[PDB]
Amino acid sequence: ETMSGPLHIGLIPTVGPYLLPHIIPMLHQTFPKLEMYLHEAQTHQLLAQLDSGKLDAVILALVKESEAFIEVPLFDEPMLLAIYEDHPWANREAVPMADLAGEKLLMLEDGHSLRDQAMGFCFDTHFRATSLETLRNMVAAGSGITLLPALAVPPERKRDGVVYLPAIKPEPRRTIGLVYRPGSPLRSRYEQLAEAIRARMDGHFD
Amino acid sequence: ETMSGPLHIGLIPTVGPYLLPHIIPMLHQTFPKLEMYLHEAQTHQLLAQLDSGKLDAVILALVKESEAFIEVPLFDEPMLLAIYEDHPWANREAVPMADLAGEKLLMLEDGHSLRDQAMGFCFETHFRATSLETLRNMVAAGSGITLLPALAVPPERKRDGVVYLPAIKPEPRRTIGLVYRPGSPLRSRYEQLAEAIRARMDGHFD
Known about the structure:
The structure is a homodimer. Chain A folds into two domains: 107 residues, Periplasmic binding protein-like II (D-Maltodextrin-Binding Protein, domain 2, 3-Layer(aba) Sandwich); 98 residues, D-Maltodextrin-Binding Protein, domain 2 (3-Layer(aba) Sandwich), CATH 3.40.190.10. Helix content of chain A is 24%, strand content 28%. Chain A is built from five helices and ten strands. The two termini of chain A are 35 Å apart. Chain A is an alpha/beta fold. At the A-B interface, helix 1, strand 2 and helix 4 of A face helix 1, strand 2 and helix 4 of B. Chain A: This is DNA-binding transcriptional dual regulator OxyR. Chain A: Belongs to the LysR transcriptional regulatory family. Chain A: GO terms for molecular function: cis-regulatory region sequence-specific DNA binding; DNA-binding transcription factor activity. Chain A: One of its GO terms (biological process) is response to oxidative stress.
C-alpha cells in the first residue's frame, strides 16, 4: 500500500554504483516513509533471491532469464568505447563497430550481463576483469580497450589516462528494467517506484 | 628497464577503485614496458593467491595476516564520517568518536578489513553492505551513517544527498601497503614499484 516500510532492492554490480546516486536522493524525498535496503549480486543471484522472496525487487539489464518475472523497462543505456590516450582513435569523434571486430578487447568475467551482451560475440582472451572499475583501469594501464555503460562514464571525454568516445553503426544498447515476482500483493508499490525512476532518467542521455 | 614484462597486482575492493585512478596513469608513463594486470578480491583471497605465486604483489590495508610476507607501507589513509543531509551533525565541523558510541552504524560485511578495523567500541544491527558503494548509498537513503576511507570520499563536503565530515579524537586511520613474497627474485622490481607509489601519494591529505 502506501509507500512506507522496509524495501529490499538488489542491483547488479554494473548498474548499482552508477545509477543509485542519480535516483536514491530523489526517491527518499518522494517516499520518506520508505526504508531502503540495497543489495548487490550477479543476475543469477539476484534472480534466485527474488524468486525465494528474499528480495522485493531487482534492477538489472533485462535478459532472457528475467522473462519469467514481471519486467518493467526503466531506460535504454548506450555503451561507449574506452581507450587509452596513446591510442590512434584517441582523436576520433566516434568509432563504427566494424572497426572493432578486427581486434580484441578486455571483457568482464562470465556472470556479468555485459559479456553475454556485447552485440553477440563477434568480439579467446584468458584474462577477465571482475569489476567494471578494475576493467576501466586496465584501459588506463594501456592493456587494451573496452565498452562501458554510459552511466559509468565521466562527463569529461578524457580522464585519468582514458578517452571515452561514442560507438556507432549500430549504437550498442542494453535495457535497464525493474523486476518483481508476478502476483506480488505490492504490485502497485513497485509500479510507482519504476514510474519515479523512469521519469527522472528520461532523456538523460542528451 | 628491469621494469618490463607482465605484472599481476591485486587490490582489495575498498582500495583498488579509489586508489588506481591516482597511480595507474603515473606508473604507465614511468614503466612503459610494464604489462599491468589488475585483480580484485578480499584480503584472505589475495593473500592466498600471493602465496601461490598467482599474484606478483598485493596492495591492501596491512593487517595481522599480511605479516608473514614483506610489508611495504605506502601511506596512512584517514577515515571520514558519512551521514545524510537531514542529520543533526550535518552542520558540524567534525565529530569526536565519543559521539558515535551510541548510534546506527552501517558496516561492511565480514571479510572486509574495515569492519574488523573497529577502532573503538559501540553497540555490537543486522544488515551488511557488500560494497563500499552500496554502503555509501544506504547513507543517501537515510538508513544510517558510516565510516569511509578518505580516497572514497568526494572533494565536495556535500554531494548526492550525503555529507562527509572529519572523525576526530582519535582520527581513524588505516595503513595501505604493498605486499610481496619474501625471497622473490624480483624483490627490486616490487621495491621500485612501492617507491613510485609512495612518492606520488606523499602528502595527499593536506
